[PDB]
Amino acid sequence: SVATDSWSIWKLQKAISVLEMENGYWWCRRKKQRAGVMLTVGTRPDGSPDERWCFRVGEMNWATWEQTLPRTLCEEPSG
Amino acid sequence: NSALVVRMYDGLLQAGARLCPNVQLEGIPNLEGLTPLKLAAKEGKIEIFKHILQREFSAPCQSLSRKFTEWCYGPVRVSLYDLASVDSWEENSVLEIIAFHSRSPHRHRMVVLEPLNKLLQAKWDRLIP
Amino acid sequence: ACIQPLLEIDRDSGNPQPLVNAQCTDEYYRGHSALHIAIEKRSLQCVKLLVENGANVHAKACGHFFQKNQDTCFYFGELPLSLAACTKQWDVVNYLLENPHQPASLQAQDSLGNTVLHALVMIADDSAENSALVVRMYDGLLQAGARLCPNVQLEGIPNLEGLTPLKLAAKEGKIEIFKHILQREFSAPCQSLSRKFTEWCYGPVRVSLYDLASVDSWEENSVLEIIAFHSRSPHRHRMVVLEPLNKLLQAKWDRLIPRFCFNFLCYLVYMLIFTAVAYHQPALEAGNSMLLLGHILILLGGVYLLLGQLWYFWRRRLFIWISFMDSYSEILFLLQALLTVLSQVLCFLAIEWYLPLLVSSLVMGWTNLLYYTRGFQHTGIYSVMIEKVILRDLLRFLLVYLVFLFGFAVALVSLSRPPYRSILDASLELFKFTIGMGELAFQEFRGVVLLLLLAYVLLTYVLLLNMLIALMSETVNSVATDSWSIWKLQKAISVLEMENGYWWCRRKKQRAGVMLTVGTRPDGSPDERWCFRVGEMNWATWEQTLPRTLCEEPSG
Amino acid sequence: TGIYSVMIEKVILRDLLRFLLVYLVFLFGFAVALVSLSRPPYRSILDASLELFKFTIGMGLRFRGVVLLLLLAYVLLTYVLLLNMLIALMSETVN
Numbered sequence A: 001s002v003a004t005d006s007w008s009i010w011k012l013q014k015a016i017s018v019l020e021m022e023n024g025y026w027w028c029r030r031k032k033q034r035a036g037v038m039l040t041v042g043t044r045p046d047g048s049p050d051e052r053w054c055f056r057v058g059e060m061n062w063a064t065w066e067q068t069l070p071r072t073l074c075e076e077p078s079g
Numbered sequence B: 001n002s003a004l005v006v007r008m009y010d011g012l013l014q015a016g017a018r019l020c021p022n023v024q025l026e027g028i029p030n031l032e033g034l035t036p037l038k039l040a041a042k043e044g045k046i047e048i049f050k051h052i053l054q055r056e057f058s059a060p061c062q063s064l065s066r067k068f069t070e071w072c073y074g075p076v077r078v079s080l081y082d083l084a085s086v087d088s089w090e091e092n093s094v095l096e097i098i099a100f101h102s103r104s105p106h107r108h109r110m111v112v113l114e115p116l117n118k119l120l121q122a123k124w125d126r127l128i129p
Numbered sequence C: 001a002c003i004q005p006l007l008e009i010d011r012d013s014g015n016p017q018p019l020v021n022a023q024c025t026d027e028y029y030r031g032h033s034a035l036h037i038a039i040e041k042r043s044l045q046c047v048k049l050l051v052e053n054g055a056n057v058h059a060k061a062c063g064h065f066f067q068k069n070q071d072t073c074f075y076f077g078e079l080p081l082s083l084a085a086c087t088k089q090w091d092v093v094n095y096l097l098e099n100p101h102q103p104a105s106l107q108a109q110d111s112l113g114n115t116v117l118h119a120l121v122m123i124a125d126d127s128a129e130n131s132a133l134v135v136r137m138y139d140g141l142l143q144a145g146a147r148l149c150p151n152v153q154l155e156g157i158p159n160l161e162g163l164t165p166l167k168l169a170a171k172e173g174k175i176e177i178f179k180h181i182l183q184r185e186f187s188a189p190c191q192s193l194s195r196k197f198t199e200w201c202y203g204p205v206r207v208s209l210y211d212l213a214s215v216d217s218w219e220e221n222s223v224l225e226i227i228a229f230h231s232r233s234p235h236r237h238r239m240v241v242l243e244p245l246n247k248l249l250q251a252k253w254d255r256l257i258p259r260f261c262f263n264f265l266c267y268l269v270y271m272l273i274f275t276a277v278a279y280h281q282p283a284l285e286a287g288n289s290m291l292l293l294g295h296i297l298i299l300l301g302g303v304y305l306l307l308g309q310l311w312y313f314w315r316r317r318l319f320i321w322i323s324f325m326d327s328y329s330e331i332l333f334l335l336q337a338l339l340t341v342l343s344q345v346l347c348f349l350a351i352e353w354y355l356p357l358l359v360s361s362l363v364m365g366w367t368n369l370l371y372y373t374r375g376f377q378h379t380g381i382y383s384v385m386i387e388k389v390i391l392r393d394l395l396r397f398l399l400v401y402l403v404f405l406f407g408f409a410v411a412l413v414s415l416s417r418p419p420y421r422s423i424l425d426a427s428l429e430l431f432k433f434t435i436g437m438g439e440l441a442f443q444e445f446r447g448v449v450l451l452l453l454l455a456y457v458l459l460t461y462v463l464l465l466n467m468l469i470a471l472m473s474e475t476v477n478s479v480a481t482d483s484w485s486i487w488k489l490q491k492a493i494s495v496l497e498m499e500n501g502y503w504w505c506r507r508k509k510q511r512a513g514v515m516l517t518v519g520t521r522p523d524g525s526p527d528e529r530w531c532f533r534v535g536e537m538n539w540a541t542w543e544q545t546l547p548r549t550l551c552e553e554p555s556g
Numbered sequence D: 001t002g003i004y005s006v007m008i009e010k011v012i013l014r015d016l017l018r019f020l021l022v023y024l025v026f027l028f029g030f031a032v033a034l035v036s037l038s039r040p041p042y043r044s045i046l047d048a049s050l051e052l053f054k055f056t057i058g059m060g061l062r063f064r065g066v067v068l069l070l071l072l073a074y075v076l077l078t079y080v081l082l083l084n085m086l087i088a089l090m091s092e093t094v095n
């Protein structure tokens, strides 16, 4: 057996719990709220602006210097 | 197999942006009402499921990407992950599919993926009380 | 194209406070300057231009974003030079060091008192790509520093925490560079910068010298003292085994075997007196004065142990607070001393509760004797695994087992036998069965009792297998080298405490290294160093080239 | 059968002797603490430690509370040593 599996199987157990908690026992309709923040990622193929509900994940990569820089939304670190 | 699938799949999305811009190909459901991503989730196709969630495209046709970078300073950066088909808020979400609908032995492997694992950690922290 | 015109306008507008040096103001981005931006954008041509128009090459970006403790924040030192260095832009670094108008200074330090070396120690992590970068830049700056400022020893500059780059690497658990610094050799002219030399070399054999400056216990806040007590990294034990330190710590131990055995005898004796005192206790009712003699010693020794442990925690443990995981052995001695002194007070004050406290201190005192097993390797590893198993692993098994025990205990007594249940007597009677002590007693629904019992015995067995499997899985997954290091660090703790001294102080013990004139041509008088000599034997040396040596022969 | 006898010798010497050293210290220390509690016709620390050993085998008011609590910790620690000894064997065989 893969050593990582037991840990992932647990994270899935939590995933089951979290989703059912959001449903609710008898007061079911309360835990209905979107996650993440909605931002304008860019323009679509269809002229309208491409807006999306996004989740923020911080990253640090030390080998990126050689590769090209990605197009970014903001000009400087914010928040 | 996986290397072909991601390479072919992406090449078709780019072509679709040029040949049929108004059409969102990943929005077309099948008779079972599953989009390609939800299908990958239900059928336990990890490698492409992973690739779709964290997709990056440069210069033209930038829009068809599920991962973006808000800002970047030196090594640090903040990445944005599209949650459209992902968020539990929506009906028949990817998470709900994996949690309950999928019948692959490796569902647990699927939960631990960059956008989903962080998201589930966030929701858990909110639900401790 | 607008920057050069734009700045000329600003100057021609009579701005007293030039625009180029304008800096950000919010607590988040405080201090950032246009030069910082040009460096981060990796544009030397822009860097040159900003400097050529009076850009302050020593402006500090001190805001929250540029701080070491924050999450999703980049700490690179605060200065432009540290930025360029920390983002691997030698083309920028060289210009900041070599431009004629305004050379950047290698001595400059930030709000934390950190130089470019300090920062490079901070940004480094154990990933391979990062580590290779840091050493390359770190060394490349030392060579430059030898050229730009010979008289200054850059690694000698401490920060506000009084830590040099090496000590910083030690406290922050930066192995790859810490290891590199200790085993550093230079082949270029600046031979003085290297900390490793070869005294002499004969055939396959040779002796290598390791600089002990920041390492040796003689100086305050030594690397060894820092790692043992100040560092708070999980892989600190990994650092102790590095080539120069392991040999060095073994040397210090070998000289300290007597003191260890002596202290073992003392504690053993103290326990024997403690043993006799508790055995001869008669509860309600020269010789009787001698029994008081015993109690006196116990009180005297218990405070001394309590004082000693307090001194250990008093000396360096004030900012640690809960160091239970780090020093499991140290805690028990304090509790034993604490419990022993408290027991004597009650004994003097005729309190009937002292006896439990007295015996409790006795039993614990003898068990604590396992402390001294660290002298030998085999027993030392066994004692380490005891500590590990008891500490982290037993809590979870027991917590689960009680739930099974309690739940099954209530159900079986409630089922068997107006009927008087004792949760204690119940759980006790069921625990002793598994423990093998006693046997279950029939009340005289027997059928249900048997089925329930079957579930218990098997399920209890399942828990054992999980504990074995979970315990077993840790050993296979754990690196074979890892378990041994934890012991060598325990020894490192002992040697350092012995060098501290008792209450009748035995300080300023003899230095462990030998001082030699490693460098012939420093800028000035010859440079002397306290080095540790380590013998080496290499049978594949014939193909490789011979190293430059201090001596010509093993003699001298 | 001959290799089986080789492993017995190895296990007895390197692993069991080490357990025995730790186990005896625990046995002595806990036996004396239990005797000091008993306190009169005094059972010898030997006679006591014997009584505590046969207790483990299952053969068979400060006094009541401490006596029981101390014993419960004893049974656990003795089992810990066995589990540790078993773990020590597994790590030795792989190497």
Ligand SMILES: C=C(C)[C@]12C[C@@H](C)[C@@]34O[C@](Cc5ccccc5)(O[C@@H]1[C@@H]3C=C(COC(=O)Cc1ccc(O)c(OC)c1)C[C@]1(O)C(=O)C(C)=C[C@@H]41)O2
Pocket (backbone or CB within 6 Å): C328, C329, C330, C332, C360, C363, C364, C365, C367, C368, C369, C370, C371, C372, C383, C384, C386, C387, C390, D070, D072, D073, D074, D076, D077
């Ligand atoms: C608070 C702690 C850390 C602690 C105190 C007591 C209860 C302890 O059991 C533990 C856990 C325990 C409690 C109750 C039942 C089983 C286990 O571990 C130690 C503590 C652990 C033991 C077992 O011996 C050891 O700790 C090994 C050891 C001793 C000294 C060392 O310097 C050492 O470092 C390597 C290791 C001795 C006891 O203190 C003891 O003699 C009594 C009566 C119980 C043991 O609790």
Ligand SMILES: [Ca+2]
Pocket (backbone or CB within 6 Å): C436
């Ligand atoms: Ca049995």
Ligand SMILES: [Ca+2]
Pocket (backbone or CB within 6 Å): none
């Ligand atoms: Ca067994």
